[PDB]
């Protein structure tokens, strides 16, 4: 790992990235962010989730440097919280309030629940755990026996056909496992197992152990598009299920899917990940989880090599990041959205933490 981690100051790289994000996208006088370079709409929740993940990981490096930033982000997330729409609370894709009709997604709630669980673990702040539980309850309310199980993409389908989605399974499973570890409430473990059983039966390709995208409710047809994050969030879930149950099937499945994910998406020679960054980061988090599992530094070698590539080859001359992680940047970006640089910041903070753990 030291060959790749060398003199690379991941922590500084993270602060650098955050500084550029704030300059470009923080809405003057607030702790909220614009969606993109046009600075014309408040950001969708997703890009803010990477900031939540970043500040949370920051606590492991310095509680005093990052606690306020994390709290300010949590308070910004309150702008997206709906306390009761049609009988249930949950986060919306855009800012909302009790008197407005929100557009809510079961996946967004799971992504957020993961970050809030980690924020609670880092700080022991009860308000973070309250919202983690509430976000996860929202995601779990999207599960029913249509298609025999699984979770809808979204609460209010308009243009998209009604469908149940691997990402919704996967982030809900991981959230369940994180809350199981915190609360020791077996209902969370049982939910993860139930959702996993459905997901493996319906959306896992047995030929390569990768995950299809979604199953359509109308006719049960499968969108067979393979995305990195559908593998990655399943891997992270399975590793927690392995720790909880001691059933080796979960570890074997995680290892099989991770190997196939590396073969499909990872160029180990240069470090490039051939998918959108806001998806492919999940393979890097899988590597970190593998190191936590088996303490084999090969997994950190991969992670640091991929993160070095992001800094050395994707970062443009203005300190901005592209959507996709597959190819070096050769000219400066004119367009960008919040998620592109926030996922990079998150990776840098993760790398900083593991460098610290090693040294």
Q: What is the CATH number of domain 1-359?
A: 1.50.10.20
H or E stretch covering 163: strand 163-165
Largest Cα separation within the chain, whole Å, is 55
Residue 32 in 3-state DSSP? coil
Q: Which of 110, 8, 52, 93 is nearest to 343 (CA)?
A: 52
Separation of alpha carbons 89 and 120, rounded Å: 20
Query: If you search the block for the tokens 């243009």, which residue do you land on?
Result: 159
Q: Which of 62, 166, 74 is nearest to 112 (CA)?
A: 74
Q: Which of 41, 75, 37, 36 is nearest to 55 (CA)?
A: 75
Q: Which of 140, 136, 137, 119 is nearest to 128 (CA)?
A: 119
* Residues 11 and 349 sit within 8 Å (Cβ to Cβ): yes
Q: Which two tokens stand for residue 308?
A: 């070095």
Sign of the CA dihedral running 309, 315, 321, 322: negative
Which residues touch 85 (CB under 8 Å, ≥6 apart)? Answer: 101, 102, 104
Q: Which of 211, 106, 92 is nearest to 168 (CA)?
A: 106
The data reach a resolution, in angstroms, of 1.5
C-alpha angle with apex 279: 179 to 80, nearest 5 degrees? 55
Separation of alpha carbons 72 and 47, rounded Å: 15
Q: Which two tokens stand for residue 37?
A: 């370079």
- Domain map of the chain by residue range? 1-359
H or E stretch covering 91: strand 88-91
Which residues touch 278 (CB under 8 Å, ≥6 apart)? Answer: 46, 50, 229, 323, 339, 340, 343
CA distances from 84 to 49, 100, 115, 285 (A): 21, 10, 22, 33
Experimental method for this entry?
X-ray
Q: Which of 71, 17, 120, 115 is nearest to 352 (CA)?
A: 17
C-alpha angle with apex 149: 148 to 150, nearest 5 degrees? 140
Q: Which of 149, 182, 156 is nearest to 92 (CA)?
A: 156
Separation of alpha carbons 46 and 277, rounded Å: 13
């Amino acid at each position: 790992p030291g060959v790749e981690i060398g003199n690379n100051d991941y922590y500084t790289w993270c602060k650098e990235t955050l500084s550029v994000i704030d300059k470009d996208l923080k809405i003057s006088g607030t702790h909220s962010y614009y969606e993109n370079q046009d600075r014309s709409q408040v950001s969708f929740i997703w890009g803010n989730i990477f900031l939540l993940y970043t500040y949370t990981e920051g606590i492991s490096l310095s509680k005093s440097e990052w606690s306020d930033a994390l709290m300010n982000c949590f308070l910004n997330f309150d702008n997206y919280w709906h306390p009761n729409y049609k009988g249930i609370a949950g986060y919306a894709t855009l800012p909302t309030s009790a008197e407005k009709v929100p557009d809510r997604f079961y996946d967004e709630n799971g992504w957020t629940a993961i970050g809030l669980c980690d924020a609670y673990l880092a700080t022991q702040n009860n308000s973070y755990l309250e919202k983690a539980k509430g976000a996860l309850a929202f995601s779990l309310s999207g599960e029913d026996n249509v298609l025999g199980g699984g979770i809808y993409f979204q609460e209010t389908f308009v243009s998209l056909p009604v469908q149940k989605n691997t990402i919704c399974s996967a982030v809900t499973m991981l959230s369940c496992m994180k809350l199981y570890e915190i609360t020791q409430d077996r209902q969370y473990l049982d939910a993860a197992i139930r959702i996993n059983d459905w997901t493996v039966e319906n959306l896992l390709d047995k030929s390569d152990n990768l995950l299809w995208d979604a199953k359509m409710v109308a006719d049960g047809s499968v969108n067979t598009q393979k995305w990195s994050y559908n593998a990655g969030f399943m891997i992270r879930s399975w590793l927690k299920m392995y720790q909880a149950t001691k059933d080796e099937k979960y570890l074997s499945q995680a290892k099989a899917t991770l190997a196939s994910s590396e073969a499909k998406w990872y160029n180990s020679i240069n470090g490039a990940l051939n998918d959108p960054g806001y998806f492919a980061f999940s393979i890097i988090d899988s590597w970190f989880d593998m190191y936590d599992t088996d303490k084999n530094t090969v997994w950190l070698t991969k992670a640091f090599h991929a993160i070095n590539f992001i800094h050395n080859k994707l970062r443009d001359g203005n300190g901005r990041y592209p959507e996709h992680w597959g190819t070096p940047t050769t000219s400066n970006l004119e367009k960008y959205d919040l998620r592109f640089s926030t996922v990079a910041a998150y990776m840098y903070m993760r790398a900083a933490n593991y460098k610290r753990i090693l040294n």
